[PDB]
């Protein structure tokens, strides 16, 4: 009924917001890992030059 | 001033970081994480009177942490050390894949390559029989060395292994 | 409305599971961030010697 | 070759990386990302005939990416450069917070501190009036410099700023 409907609707909103926060965190992980790769790649090229 | 590049290839969690750290730092690393990209470790030695800088490359074993670095590994390589976990048959069965990767990136089939089985101190959990790994080592014309990064106790001490490979390279 | 009631419950269950995955992902974020700081801190100490 | 440490503090996305890269690389960076920890850039200069190595530290502005590095910033620091975004009043109001961070980490008032407003090329979106930032700069006894990493047309070019700071440091 009414009261069940709005309860679920509010939970749906929190569910969506919570997903977005997981998306941001996964984005930030990919940023960190890929940036680390750029670091070690440059260092690798420096050493292979010698 | 000669620098010899020695790469360390193998699956994840086999002990590449612990072996390279054992040779350069002389001690077993206590708290270890997944290697991201490469970990460069260098050690100077005097072989036959000549001073030589051994540069070990602790490559990654996780595909998410090594997909972009593969060809950086195989440039001006002087020696390749394959590592498998003696307590993990799956890491042993992955060696043909690494040998193929080594075939596809190398272009000289003479550089010294060695096979190393790690974690032999865990004698109660060894899964790769010595004869099987020895027969495989012979197939690809490599010496087999069963050792442990955490405790070389009267069994192919780590110092002897890398010194043997570097003593080969001076030639 | 009984169909709405169990439907709600399933979303709640999925919500809790999503929290667990976001916790692990946030853990991995801290894993990465702290490792970056370690590398940068050592570089700082090397430079602070001069 | 005496080395001078100059740290660059400010909020996130104000343009610290673009200013330091402009001074050291002599060109505007075509692409940047969020600085993690520190980002070290060095440039050799000739001040009054003496060769000096200016060591700019591009600190981070995001609290989660700098909370552990603060005391590495303020150790043996020779000069401090505070930066705000001229197109962001909120970054200007954050300057008292950064000055508090500086005072809490330094007990000596002998080192030069300067205040710099970036992104002055966006003349249509400037939000911080020159008089207000000057009045604040005067309060804490700092010189004010309004400039741009990209195009400071007749407006306090970046090299002139850091050369002035290094020239004052040599004395
Ligand atoms: N008992 C025993 N455990 C070892 C030995 N060497 C490594 N380990 C364990 O192996 C685990 C991780 O080994 P790593 O050296 O990180 O393996 P790795 O090749 O660096 O793994 P990746 O970096 O992900 O490729 C840790 O739990 C270590 O304690 C060893 O010689 N003996
Ligand atoms: N128009 C204009 N944009 C600028 C100027 N300087 C920097 N930017 C812009 O500022 C943005 C990012 O600036 P950053 O140098 O990365 O700022 P930051 O201080 O390093 O940021 P954090 O590392 O996160 O603390 C980019 O969009 C640049 O284009 C400038 O002089 N003029
Ligand atoms: Mg490793
Ligand atoms: Mg920056």
Residue numbers in the entry:
A (entry chain J), C (entry chain I): 159 to 208
B (entry chain B), D (entry chain A): 31 to 201
From the paper:
The Atg12-Atg5/Atg16 complex has E3 ligase activity towards Atg8 and LC3 lipidation. Rab proteins are key regulators of intracellular membrane trafficking processes and are also involved in the formation and maturation of autophagosomes and their fusion with lysosomes. Rab33B interacts with Atg16L1 in a GTP dependent manner and therefore Atg16L1 is an effector of Rab33B. The interaction between Atg16L1 and Rab33B might facilitate the recruitment of Golgi derived vesicles to the growing isolation membrane.
